[PDB]
Protein backbone atom coordinates (compact mmCIF):
# COMPACT_ATOMS: atom_id res chain seq x y z
CA UNK A 1 0.00 0.00 0.00
CA UNK A 2 1.40 3.40 -1.19
CA UNK A 3 -0.04 6.63 0.29
CA UNK A 4 -1.68 9.08 -2.21
CA UNK A 5 0.36 12.27 -2.79
CA UNK A 6 -1.01 15.71 -1.81
CA UNK A 7 -3.75 16.82 -4.34
CA UNK A 8 -3.58 13.31 -6.03
CA UNK A 9 -6.93 11.86 -7.18
CA UNK A 10 -7.80 8.21 -8.04
CA UNK A 11 -8.87 7.25 -10.50
CA UNK A 12 -6.86 9.82 -12.64
CA UNK A 13 -10.08 11.49 -14.10
CA UNK A 14 -12.63 14.17 -13.04
CA UNK A 15 -14.90 13.12 -10.13
CA UNK A 16 -18.19 13.47 -12.05
CA UNK A 17 -16.97 11.31 -15.07
CA UNK A 18 -18.32 7.80 -15.80
CA UNK A 19 -15.08 5.97 -14.72
CA UNK A 20 -15.09 7.77 -11.33
CA UNK A 21 -18.30 8.68 -9.34
CA UNK A 22 -20.30 9.94 -12.38
CA UNK A 23 -22.67 12.87 -12.75
CA UNK A 24 -24.39 15.18 -10.19
CA UNK A 25 -28.12 14.16 -9.99
CA UNK A 26 -28.87 17.42 -8.09
CA UNK A 27 -29.11 18.77 -4.49
CA UNK A 28 -31.06 16.78 -1.79
CA UNK A 29 -32.73 18.94 0.93
CA UNK A 30 -34.40 17.85 4.23
CA UNK A 31 -37.83 18.65 2.55
CA UNK A 32 -37.19 16.42 -0.55
CA UNK A 33 -38.67 12.98 -1.36
CA UNK A 34 -35.05 11.88 -2.19
CA UNK A 35 -34.15 12.68 1.51
CA UNK A 36 -35.62 9.20 2.36
CA UNK A 37 -32.92 7.54 0.11
CA UNK A 38 -30.39 8.88 2.75
CA UNK A 39 -29.88 6.56 5.76
CA UNK A 40 -27.92 7.39 8.97
CA UNK A 41 -24.64 5.48 9.73
CA UNK A 42 -24.45 4.46 13.47
CA UNK A 43 -21.22 2.39 13.19
CA UNK A 44 -19.76 2.58 16.76
CA UNK A 45 -16.22 2.50 15.23
CA UNK A 46 -16.65 5.73 13.08
CA UNK A 47 -16.22 9.16 14.76
CA UNK A 48 -18.71 11.74 13.33
CA UNK A 49 -17.63 15.38 13.98
CA UNK A 50 -21.29 16.60 13.81
CA UNK A 51 -20.15 20.19 14.66
CA UNK A 52 -23.63 21.07 13.14
CA UNK A 53 -25.32 19.22 16.11
CA UNK A 54 -27.88 17.87 13.53
CA UNK A 55 -26.48 14.34 12.76
CA UNK A 56 -26.18 15.41 9.05
CA UNK A 57 -22.58 14.04 8.89
CA UNK A 58 -24.05 10.51 9.49
CA UNK A 59 -26.53 10.79 6.55
CA UNK A 60 -25.33 9.29 3.20
CA UNK A 61 -26.39 6.86 0.38
CA UNK A 62 -26.42 3.04 0.78
CA UNK A 63 -23.20 2.71 -1.39
CA UNK A 64 -21.47 5.50 0.63
CA UNK A 65 -22.36 3.62 3.89
CA UNK A 66 -21.01 0.34 2.50
CA UNK A 67 -17.61 1.74 1.40
CA UNK A 68 -17.38 3.82 4.64
CA UNK A 69 -18.08 0.69 6.81
CA UNK A 70 -15.35 -1.24 4.88
CA UNK A 71 -12.84 1.63 5.44
CA UNK A 72 -13.71 1.69 9.22
CA UNK A 73 -12.37 -1.90 9.47
CA UNK A 74 -9.14 -1.22 7.46
CA UNK A 75 -8.31 1.96 9.50
CA UNK A 76 -8.48 0.04 12.88
CA UNK A 77 -6.26 -2.68 11.30
CA UNK A 78 -3.71 -0.09 9.95
CA UNK A 79 -3.14 1.83 13.26
CA UNK A 80 -3.91 0.21 16.67
CA UNK A 81 -6.39 2.29 18.74
CA UNK A 82 -7.16 4.70 15.83
CA UNK A 83 -10.57 5.06 14.12
CA UNK A 84 -12.00 6.50 10.90
CA UNK A 85 -13.45 10.06 11.41
CA UNK A 86 -16.02 11.91 9.19
CA UNK A 87 -15.98 15.77 9.28
CA UNK A 88 -18.68 16.10 6.53
CA UNK A 89 -21.21 13.65 5.01
CA UNK A 90 -24.49 14.94 3.61
CA UNK A 91 -24.29 18.77 3.70
CA UNK A 92 -27.12 21.36 4.01
CA UNK A 93 -24.77 24.33 5.05
CA UNK A 94 -23.41 25.08 1.48
CA UNK A 95 -19.86 24.35 2.83
CA UNK A 96 -18.65 22.67 -0.45
CA UNK A 97 -18.18 23.23 -4.23
CA UNK A 98 -21.29 24.57 -6.08
CA UNK A 99 -22.59 21.07 -7.13
CA UNK A 100 -20.84 18.98 -4.46
CA UNK A 101 -21.64 15.22 -4.26
CA UNK A 102 -21.99 16.09 -0.49
CA UNK A 103 -25.35 17.80 -1.33
CA UNK A 104 -26.83 14.38 -2.37
CA UNK A 105 -25.16 12.24 0.34
CA UNK A 106 -22.55 10.65 -2.00
CA UNK A 107 -19.36 12.04 -0.39
CA UNK A 108 -17.53 12.08 2.95
CA UNK A 109 -14.59 14.16 4.09
CA UNK A 110 -12.45 12.02 6.41
CA UNK A 111 -9.46 12.01 8.80
CA UNK A 112 -8.12 9.61 11.40
CA UNK A 113 -9.53 9.91 14.98
CA UNK A 114 -6.13 11.32 16.18
CA UNK A 115 -6.14 14.09 13.44
CA UNK A 116 -2.51 13.09 12.60
CA UNK A 117 -2.06 14.74 9.17
CA UNK A 118 0.95 12.38 8.46
CA UNK A 119 -1.59 9.45 8.23
CA UNK A 120 -3.91 11.13 5.64
CA UNK A 121 -2.08 9.95 2.45
CA UNK A 122 -2.33 6.30 3.65
CA UNK A 123 -5.97 6.98 4.83
CA UNK A 124 -6.71 8.00 1.19
CA UNK A 125 -5.08 4.77 -0.14
CA UNK A 126 -7.24 2.72 2.35
CA UNK A 127 -10.34 4.60 0.97
CA UNK A 128 -9.37 3.48 -2.60
CA UNK A 129 -8.91 -0.20 -1.40
CA UNK A 130 -12.31 0.05 0.52
CA UNK A 131 -13.91 0.76 -2.92
CA UNK A 132 -14.71 4.47 -2.97
CA UNK A 133 -15.35 5.43 -6.71
CA UNK A 134 -13.24 8.67 -6.33
CA UNK A 135 -10.61 9.64 -3.69
CA UNK A 136 -8.94 13.09 -3.62
CA UNK A 137 -6.22 14.30 -1.14
CA UNK A 138 -8.12 17.60 -1.22
CA UNK A 139 -6.49 19.54 1.69
CA UNK A 140 -3.87 19.21 4.46
CA UNK A 141 -6.88 18.67 6.78
CA UNK A 142 -8.95 15.98 4.95
CA UNK A 143 -9.49 13.33 2.23
CA UNK A 144 -12.62 13.68 0.03
CA UNK A 145 -14.20 10.33 -0.96
CA UNK A 146 -17.27 9.82 -3.18
CA UNK A 147 -19.39 7.03 -4.75
CA UNK A 148 -21.57 6.41 -7.83
CA UNK A 149 -25.35 6.97 -7.37
CA UNK A 150 -27.62 3.95 -6.54
CA UNK A 151 -29.11 4.66 -10.04
Amino acid at each position, epitope marked *: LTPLAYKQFIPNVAEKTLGASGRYEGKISRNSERFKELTPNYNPDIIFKD*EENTGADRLMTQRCKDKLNALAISVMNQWPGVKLRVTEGWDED*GH*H*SEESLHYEGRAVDITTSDRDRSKYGMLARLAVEAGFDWVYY*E*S*K*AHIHCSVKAEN
Partner: antibody
Amino acid sequence: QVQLQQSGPELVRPGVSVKISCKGSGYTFIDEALHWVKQSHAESLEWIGVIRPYSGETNYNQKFKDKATMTVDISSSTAYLELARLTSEDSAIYYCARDWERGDFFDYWGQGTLVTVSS
Amino acid sequence: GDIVMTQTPKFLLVSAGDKVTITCKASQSVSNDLTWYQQKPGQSPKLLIYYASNRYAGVPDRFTGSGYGTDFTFTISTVQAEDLAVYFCQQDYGSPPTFGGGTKVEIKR
Protein backbone atom coordinates in the same frame (compact mmCIF):
# COMPACT_ATOMS: atom_id res chain seq x y z
CA GLN B 1 -23.19 32.63 16.58
CA VAL B 2 -19.48 31.55 16.22
CA GLN B 3 -17.57 34.48 17.89
CA LEU B 4 -13.93 35.03 18.87
CA GLN B 5 -13.68 37.79 21.53
CA GLN B 6 -10.18 39.33 21.98
CA SER B 7 -8.79 41.28 24.94
CA GLY B 8 -8.35 45.04 24.91
CA PRO B 9 -5.58 47.28 23.59
CA GLU B 10 -2.13 47.17 25.29
CA LEU B 11 0.62 49.76 25.77
CA VAL B 12 3.95 48.06 26.63
CA ARG B 13 7.58 49.25 26.85
CA PRO B 14 10.18 47.72 24.56
CA GLY B 15 11.84 44.66 26.22
CA VAL B 16 8.68 43.92 28.31
CA SER B 17 6.27 41.05 27.47
CA VAL B 18 2.50 41.16 26.91
CA LYS B 19 -0.08 38.35 26.92
CA ILE B 20 -3.33 38.76 24.93
CA SER B 21 -6.42 36.48 24.86
CA CYS B 22 -9.04 35.15 22.43
CA LYS B 23 -12.25 33.53 23.79
CA GLY B 24 -14.29 31.29 21.48
CA SER B 25 -18.09 30.84 21.72
CA GLY B 26 -20.93 29.33 19.63
CA TYR B 27 -18.90 26.16 18.84
CA THR B 28 -17.10 23.33 20.72
CA PHE B 29 -13.66 24.86 21.47
CA ILE B 30 -11.59 21.59 20.84
CA ASP B 31 -13.41 21.06 17.44
CA GLU B 32 -11.22 23.69 15.68
CA ALA B 33 -7.60 24.95 15.56
CA LEU B 34 -6.89 28.62 16.44
CA HIS B 35 -4.37 30.73 14.46
CA TRP B 36 -2.71 34.04 15.29
CA VAL B 37 -2.19 36.68 12.52
CA LYS B 38 -0.26 40.03 12.79
CA GLN B 39 -1.37 43.09 10.73
CA SER B 40 1.16 46.01 10.53
CA HIS B 41 1.43 48.91 7.99
CA ALA B 42 5.00 47.68 7.07
CA GLU B 43 4.24 43.95 6.43
CA SER B 44 0.38 43.69 5.87
CA LEU B 45 -0.86 40.22 7.16
CA GLU B 46 1.60 37.66 8.59
CA TRP B 47 0.75 34.21 10.01
CA ILE B 48 2.32 33.77 13.52
CA GLY B 49 1.26 30.17 14.26
CA VAL B 50 -1.47 27.70 15.21
CA ILE B 51 -2.51 25.85 18.37
CA ARG B 52 -4.72 22.70 18.25
CA PRO B 53 -6.62 22.71 21.61
CA TYR B 54 -7.66 19.02 21.14
CA SER B 55 -3.97 17.88 21.38
CA GLY B 56 -2.28 21.10 22.70
CA GLU B 57 0.18 20.85 19.69
CA THR B 58 1.67 24.15 18.35
CA ASN B 59 3.34 25.09 15.01
CA TYR B 60 5.19 28.46 14.89
CA ASN B 61 6.24 30.52 11.86
CA GLN B 62 10.08 30.49 12.24
CA LYS B 63 10.04 34.36 11.96
CA PHE B 64 8.09 34.41 15.34
CA LYS B 65 9.63 31.32 17.11
CA ASP B 66 11.71 33.50 19.61
CA LYS B 67 8.94 36.15 19.95
CA ALA B 68 5.67 34.25 20.48
CA THR B 69 4.23 31.61 22.89
CA MET B 70 0.72 30.16 22.24
CA THR B 71 -1.37 28.46 25.07
CA VAL B 72 -5.06 27.45 25.60
CA ASP B 73 -7.41 27.01 28.59
CA ILE B 74 -10.11 24.57 27.36
CA SER B 75 -12.36 25.09 30.44
CA SER B 76 -12.74 28.83 29.59
CA SER B 77 -12.64 28.32 25.74
CA THR B 78 -9.70 30.87 25.70
CA ALA B 79 -6.39 30.94 23.68
CA TYR B 80 -3.44 33.18 24.75
CA LEU B 81 -0.59 34.76 22.78
CA GLU B 82 2.46 35.90 24.79
CA LEU B 83 4.93 38.19 22.93
CA ALA B 84 8.38 38.67 24.56
CA ARG B 85 11.34 41.11 24.18
CA LEU B 86 9.15 43.57 22.21
CA THR B 87 10.43 46.39 19.93
CA SER B 88 8.41 49.00 17.95
CA GLU B 89 8.50 46.48 14.99
CA ASP B 90 6.00 44.51 17.18
CA SER B 91 3.40 47.39 17.20
CA ALA B 92 0.42 45.92 15.24
CA ILE B 93 -3.13 44.58 15.33
CA TYR B 94 -3.03 40.92 16.46
CA TYR B 95 -5.92 38.72 15.36
CA CYS B 96 -6.96 35.21 16.38
CA ALA B 97 -8.74 33.27 13.62
CA ARG B 98 -10.43 29.85 13.45
CA ASP B 99 -10.00 27.26 10.68
CA TRP B 100 -12.80 24.81 9.86
CA GLU B 101 -10.71 21.71 9.07
CA ARG B 102 -10.58 22.52 5.30
CA GLY B 103 -6.95 23.79 5.30
CA ASP B 104 -5.00 26.60 7.05
CA PHE B 105 -7.42 29.46 6.14
CA PHE B 106 -9.97 31.16 8.37
CA ASP B 107 -13.82 31.53 8.38
CA TYR B 108 -14.03 33.38 11.75
CA TRP B 109 -11.72 36.19 12.97
CA GLY B 110 -11.46 38.00 16.35
CA GLN B 111 -12.00 41.81 16.28
CA GLY B 112 -8.25 42.30 16.80
CA THR B 113 -6.06 43.56 19.69
CA LEU B 114 -4.00 46.74 19.04
CA VAL B 115 -0.56 46.45 20.70
CA THR B 116 1.50 49.69 20.89
CA VAL B 117 5.19 49.11 21.85
CA SER B 118 6.49 52.46 23.08
CA SER B 119 8.34 54.16 25.91
CA GLY C 1 12.42 29.91 1.11
CA ASP C 2 8.93 30.94 2.31
CA ILE C 3 6.41 31.53 -0.55
CA VAL C 4 5.93 35.16 -1.61
CA MET C 5 2.51 36.30 -2.88
CA THR C 6 2.69 39.42 -5.15
CA GLN C 7 -0.72 41.13 -5.46
CA THR C 8 -1.57 43.68 -8.19
CA PRO C 9 -2.73 46.30 -8.60
CA LYS C 10 -2.22 48.04 -5.15
CA PHE C 11 -5.31 50.35 -5.70
CA LEU C 12 -8.38 50.41 -8.00
CA LEU C 13 -10.88 53.23 -8.46
CA VAL C 14 -14.13 51.80 -9.90
CA SER C 15 -17.75 53.00 -10.49
CA ALA C 16 -20.69 50.83 -9.33
CA GLY C 17 -21.63 48.31 -12.09
CA ASP C 18 -18.00 48.00 -13.35
CA LYS C 19 -15.63 44.96 -13.18
CA VAL C 20 -12.74 44.57 -10.65
CA THR C 21 -9.83 42.25 -11.59
CA ILE C 22 -7.13 41.49 -8.96
CA THR C 23 -4.07 39.33 -9.55
CA CYS C 24 -2.12 37.21 -7.08
CA LYS C 25 1.20 35.61 -8.25
CA ALA C 26 3.06 33.10 -6.03
CA SER C 27 6.90 32.80 -6.08
CA GLN C 28 6.28 29.04 -6.70
CA SER C 29 3.24 26.84 -7.44
CA VAL C 30 0.65 26.57 -4.59
CA SER C 31 -1.70 24.11 -6.43
CA ASN C 32 -5.24 25.53 -5.65
CA ASP C 33 -4.49 26.33 -1.89
CA LEU C 34 -5.33 30.02 -2.48
CA THR C 35 -7.90 31.96 -0.34
CA TRP C 36 -9.36 35.48 -1.00
CA TYR C 37 -10.50 37.69 1.92
CA GLN C 38 -12.40 41.02 2.01
CA GLN C 39 -11.48 43.54 4.78
CA LYS C 40 -14.01 46.42 5.04
CA PRO C 41 -12.97 49.56 6.96
CA GLY C 42 -12.61 49.00 10.74
CA GLN C 43 -13.50 45.25 10.40
CA SER C 44 -11.68 41.91 10.50
CA PRO C 45 -11.06 40.08 7.21
CA LYS C 46 -13.97 38.00 5.87
CA LEU C 47 -13.50 34.78 3.81
CA LEU C 48 -14.99 35.00 0.27
CA ILE C 49 -13.20 32.30 -1.86
CA TYR C 50 -11.12 29.18 -0.98
CA TYR C 51 -9.46 26.42 -3.10
CA ALA C 52 -8.94 29.30 -5.66
CA SER C 53 -12.58 29.15 -7.00
CA ASN C 54 -15.04 27.91 -4.27
CA ARG C 55 -17.31 30.65 -2.84
CA TYR C 56 -17.83 30.41 0.94
CA ALA C 57 -21.53 29.95 1.99
CA GLY C 58 -23.61 33.16 1.52
CA VAL C 59 -20.96 34.94 -0.72
CA PRO C 60 -22.76 36.60 -3.70
CA ASP C 61 -22.41 35.46 -7.39
CA ARG C 62 -20.46 38.62 -8.44
CA PHE C 63 -17.34 37.25 -6.58
CA THR C 64 -15.28 34.60 -8.44
CA GLY C 65 -11.71 33.28 -8.43
CA SER C 66 -9.62 31.15 -10.80
CA GLY C 67 -6.11 29.72 -11.19
CA TYR C 68 -3.80 26.82 -10.34
CA GLY C 69 -0.01 26.96 -9.73
CA THR C 70 1.38 30.53 -9.42
CA ASP C 71 -1.18 32.78 -11.23
CA PHE C 72 -4.55 33.57 -9.54
CA THR C 73 -7.34 35.93 -10.55
CA PHE C 74 -10.11 37.43 -8.32
CA THR C 75 -13.06 39.15 -10.07
CA ILE C 76 -16.08 41.25 -8.92
CA SER C 77 -18.20 41.12 -12.13
CA THR C 78 -20.29 44.21 -11.20
CA VAL C 79 -18.86 45.96 -8.11
CA GLN C 80 -21.41 47.43 -5.64
CA ALA C 81 -21.01 50.48 -3.30
CA GLU C 82 -20.68 48.15 -0.22
CA ASP C 83 -17.75 46.26 -1.86
CA LEU C 84 -15.26 48.97 -0.88
CA ALA C 85 -12.55 47.05 1.08
CA VAL C 86 -8.95 45.81 0.95
CA TYR C 87 -8.95 42.34 -0.77
CA PHE C 88 -6.06 39.95 0.15
CA CYS C 89 -4.97 36.51 -1.18
CA GLN C 90 -3.40 33.88 1.11
CA GLN C 91 -1.61 30.65 0.09
CA ASP C 92 -1.47 27.66 2.49
CA TYR C 93 0.24 25.18 0.10
CA GLY C 94 3.60 25.82 1.80
CA SER C 95 4.40 26.37 5.51
CA PRO C 96 4.13 29.05 6.71
CA PRO C 97 0.91 30.38 5.14
CA THR C 98 1.63 33.81 3.50
CA PHE C 99 -0.57 36.72 2.37
CA GLY C 100 -0.50 39.21 -0.52
CA GLY C 101 0.00 42.88 0.31
CA GLY C 102 -3.64 43.72 -0.52
CA THR C 103 -5.60 45.67 -3.18
CA LYS C 104 -7.63 48.70 -1.97
CA VAL C 105 -10.91 48.95 -3.93
CA GLU C 106 -12.34 52.52 -3.80
CA ILE C 107 -15.65 53.60 -5.35
CA LYS C 108 -15.98 56.38 -8.00
CA ARG C 109 -19.35 58.27 -7.88
